Amino acid sequence: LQLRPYQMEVAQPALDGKNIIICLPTGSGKTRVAVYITKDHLDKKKQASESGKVIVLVNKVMLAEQLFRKEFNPYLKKWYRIIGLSGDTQLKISFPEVVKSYDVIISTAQILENSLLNLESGDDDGVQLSDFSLIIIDECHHTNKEAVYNNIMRRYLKQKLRNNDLKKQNKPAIPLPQILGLTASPGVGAAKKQSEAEKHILNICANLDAFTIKTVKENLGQLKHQIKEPCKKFVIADDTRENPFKEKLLEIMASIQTYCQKSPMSDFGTQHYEQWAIQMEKKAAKDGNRKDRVCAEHLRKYNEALQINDTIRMIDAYSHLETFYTDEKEKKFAVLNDSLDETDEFLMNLFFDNKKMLKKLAENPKYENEKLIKLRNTILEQFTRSEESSRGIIFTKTRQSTYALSQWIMENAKFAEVGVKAHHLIGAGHSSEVKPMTQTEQKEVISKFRTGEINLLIATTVAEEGLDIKECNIVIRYGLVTNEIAMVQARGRARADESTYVLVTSSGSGVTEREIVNDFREKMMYKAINRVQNMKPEEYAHKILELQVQSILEKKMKVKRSIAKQYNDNPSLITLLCKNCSMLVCSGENIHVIEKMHHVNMTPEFKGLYIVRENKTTNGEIICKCGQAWGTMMVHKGLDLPCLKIRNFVVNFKNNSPKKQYKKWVELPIRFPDLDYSEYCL
Amino acid sequence: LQLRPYQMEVAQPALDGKNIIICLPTGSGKTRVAVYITKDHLDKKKQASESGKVIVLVNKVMLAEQLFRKEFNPYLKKWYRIIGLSGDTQLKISFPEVVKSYDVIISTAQILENSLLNLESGDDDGVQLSDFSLIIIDECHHTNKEAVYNNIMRRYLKQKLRNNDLKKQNKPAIPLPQILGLTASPGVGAAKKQSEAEKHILNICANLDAFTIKTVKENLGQLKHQIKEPCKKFVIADDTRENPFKEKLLEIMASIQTYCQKSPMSDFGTQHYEQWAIQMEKKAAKDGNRKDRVCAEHLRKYNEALQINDTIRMIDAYSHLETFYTDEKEKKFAVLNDSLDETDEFLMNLFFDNKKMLKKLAENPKYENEKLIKLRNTILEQFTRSEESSRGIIFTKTRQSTYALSQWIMENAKFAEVGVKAHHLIGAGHSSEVKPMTQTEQKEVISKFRTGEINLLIATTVAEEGLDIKECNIVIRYGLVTNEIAMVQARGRARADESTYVLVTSSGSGVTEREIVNDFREKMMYKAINRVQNMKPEEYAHKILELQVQSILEKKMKVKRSIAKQYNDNPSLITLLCKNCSMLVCSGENIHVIEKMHHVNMTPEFKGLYIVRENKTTNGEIICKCGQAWGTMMVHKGLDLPCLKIRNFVVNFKNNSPKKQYKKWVELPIRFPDLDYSEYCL
RNA sequence: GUCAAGCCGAGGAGA
RNA sequence: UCUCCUCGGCUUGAC
RNA sequence: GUCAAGCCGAGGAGA
RNA sequence: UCUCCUCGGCUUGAC
Ligand SMILES: [Zn+2]
Ligand SMILES: [Zn+2]
């Protein structure tokens, strides 16, 4: 085992109790300190002949795998038992046994939280914090209002308050395990005033029951000498192109609005216009009136097209619009086949013509963009001066930006002659209609980029966290900004001597202000850390107890308000109607539930009312006669049961029918019966 | 006849209807209970003057023979007629007559299933379950998703649902026979949560229409007193040798990969690397490109060599590699005789040299292994302390492990001076290129080991089931684990007072976790058995009917999806090409079928295109000009017809030719004509 | 009584 | 989906 | 080992 | 409240 002087200095208090936090810059070997502390604690327990239980909590499965593979297991594999859990991992043994089997655990917090909830509900034995002797948390800054770590530590704090009550009343008390937290930047919860930043840091400490931040001061110099600082670069551009195509799109906007006779009262292409369109569509659906709901949806689509145009070339906005409208036309063709609306037909007659005109206009690369040209100039100069040693990382905002920029970079032959290789990267969560990337695909891309099979990697906020890469020189941000914590993490991910942290932005975005404020929050955070390290121990204890009570009572009354908050036992006392068109779809008696998860009806009347879409190229889509999507087919129990999304339906109570929208099955108060499938048999 | 109090307690409900299950530990005389119940049922039928038909179903022919010989026949031979059937037995009488002749039957389930299928298809009269009056099933735990017992009981459950429909509609109904099931551990279908284990047990009960598990509780104590528990032992070793030879093999790996310019992206020696190699070879064959398919195959061979090295000494991996490459060289010599490829010749020039070097290096027993040394130490201490009373049983994973360990144990003189005698044992199914052991050979080895002619018996999963041996003290597992059911059966096969259940394992394998989880699943299974025995009879009936409908509908829609699932009447509309090399081999017009089983072509053009290998020392092998194996010669009809394996060929449709691999004759949609051999005559 | 070949299906373990 | 292991059934043929 | 679907919760940014 | 992005957990199913 190897340790360094500043590591001892920071970790010295933890060696004897002192449940504390640790904050060190990236690449400081925090995991090494954690493993050393765990080994010391286990040795002390074995010498003392008491049970030694250690758990490590991480918010990312990849982090758990990396910790169990690279650093944690190899050092301590021989002395004790080690294992790493996760949802992906097949927890075939159990959670409780691995707790009372290995004496050392690595896992995501939510697994432990689920075990605790099972224990309190009595469904499973689960485990209690008292069964442990040491908790280690990674990325403490995520411990906040009601995150998972915060739930675990709220449980611990309730136990500690119970112990406080007993000590002055009953001598026996439940022992509480030591708590160690790790991070690099504890962060600022939007607190601007340095006093508010101090309050935020004290809240973080109280959430962990931390005795002190305990940052390195004496040996700090040597640490600073060992760590290096990259180089920055700012680049700003102004928008003056897009006039022809954008003006034509705005003319289409105006025509549609005059058809609807509506006043947006806001500049076109802003998310406020999207919000207004959503509100208008919701109101139209609630009132049951047509001619505006479908028009509101189309206005929303045109607004999204205008936004993507503002951010991306005309061809991408055209592709989005024509894909959506080709899907709508396929819906209309299917509706005609199984068997004319003034709004739909008016819009479509306007469209076909304007779509042909915009196809003709789209073949005009004279005014495509300038930010992309400037990006090309940047890319080429840095990669040419790198001479094949450029590990380019691109950060953008959305999925479509990544896809389109990767495609158009591959199209360009200048990068090809330079030898650049570009591949895109995105998250896992399925959303935005875009194909998510599987964790296996993520790992494949990262491995290719590490070994050099990929020289240019387009990514999103995922790259800003994790993604341990040996070399990262040219890290460019294409008009985005998240916060000081992620900003510092990304700027520290450029782990190379001559690394360019380049910010390619539009003049409108004030990212320079945010980076300046981030550096100032960094120095303010260091100052607040020094202050708290210099605050009175008694006052520090009083304030941490204060914020502990804050959190405890907040959670208590959150449960109080959310005991039920919605109670009604009315199995079949509503009518569900279609959204775009108002016809009786179902009632509360013909519908049934599966697994307490999926809602579906199987009555032949339902069968002979809807329409089925040929699956896009088993789980085929199901739609209405007006083209409104109702759900998807499912194969559970073997029956081809059409599950439906309540977001696409509307509700009407039999009592008074105040039409409203739910947007989610759980949100509504009433309950639907479980699918007792004794019927449908033969 | 002899019976014991707990046997009456468990079997009392079955004496009057109550189609149920029974679970008792090994050596509890379950067969005695079954024969007593059968005698009681027959006596009741004769007193009542109604036909009494009893069938016994077993999944192993040896089990049927043992039951008919030792316990079942002798007790009841006088009162009624008894017989035991099996595929090995010459069923010259018939199935239906023995059903309506003996009034008592012992057989494998598949015989009854085939009779039922013949009856439904109308080809043969067959028999129906209504013709029976009592079914007894052995090893109920095998009754699962779609095993044979599950098919029989699905037929029975469909009949029962028909009867349920009639009772409320038509008074007359088809009588259903009583059902009795037997086992020792009903098992857990991977269900971890105790609720999921309860669901699995309820599914098992529903599959058998069981009214209750009916386990012994009152007299359980006496049973526990009568049965004894062996002693356990764990031993773990770590791997640090193999560096020279393994490093040289990995250098060969790297050279081959650089020749192919491929990135495995995974640690060498893992089955994932084998899967990737298989996928790459399949892709190469599909695309018709060479230089990678043969290279992929050789990479697979080297991976297998590395795995066997990791598990076994260097000499075994060398023997495997040199045998395979000597076969390849014999193929090449034959190809040269009947008449140079860059990949083959490059690989072979690399090989000859590296093979000579590895021969020179192989004579180095300084770092052969440590797990084998530890195994030797174990073996010697237990056999020395046994003083010739050691019935050693060794469990391993594969055929080659058994062969090599037996050979190397016989080579060692320490066991020889101790007087140890070692013989290997394997299954019957032909696979892995290894000579399978005939059931006659199996019986010979088991008889020799029982009488003491063999003191050490190396075996595989076969030994974990059946293999009734009087004495078994030292049962050692050399790095393997299957499940809780087989674990408990094997641990109960150590039927002696002082028996050592020894687990010799590598530190990597977590067999200790699995055995702990197996004991915990045992107690959880007992708890679930108690619960179901304490569940409400009405709720129990409802849930069993629920799962019965589950299974019935699942099978219904499985047939629905598998009515045909692949339909095409195109006698000669494809071209079959060789796999390793892409040349036209045959078409769909020149090929013919025999017995609906064997595929072959006899055109002289086919004759003058392939090559024949001298049979390894009638059914000689047939190969291509590129060394690819095409099939084997056959003598059916008397003609020397070369049958071919579709796994070694590739297909090309005349319409659009999307090259694909079938791997099996049945899987493909099209049909080939029967061999009308009116041609070829004179 | 013994052997060889081929085909079909099923289960378990691992990945 | 792949590997390993196990089981049963069917057909042919030979000794 | 791989894939698809669905559901639940949480965090960050913007408005 | 809406949009965008990210994360984790659960269930099912298939290969
Ligand atoms: Zn509608
Ligand atoms: Zn060939």
Residue numbers in the entry:
A (entry chain A), B (entry chain A): 307 to 645, 669 to 946, 956 to 1020
The publication says:
MDA5 recognizes double-stranded RNA (dsRNA) from viruses and retroelements.
Four cryo-EM datasets were collected: I923V MDA5 filaments with ATP, transition-state analog ADP-AlF4, or no nucleotide bound and A946T filaments without nucleotide. In the absence of nucleotide, the I923V and A946T variants both had similar twist distributions to WT MDA5, with intermediate to high twists (81°–96°). Closer examination of the structures of the I923V and A946T variants did not reveal any noteworthy changes in the fold of the CTD, where both substitutions are located. There are minor differences in the conformation of the loop in the WT and A946T structures, but these differences do not alter the protein fold, RNA binding interface, or active site. The A946T variant was notable in that its ATPase and filament-forming activities were the same as WT MDA5. The A946T substitution had no apparent effect on ATPase activity, structure, or filament formation on dsRNA in our assays, leaving the molecular basis of T1D-protective effects of this mutant unclear.
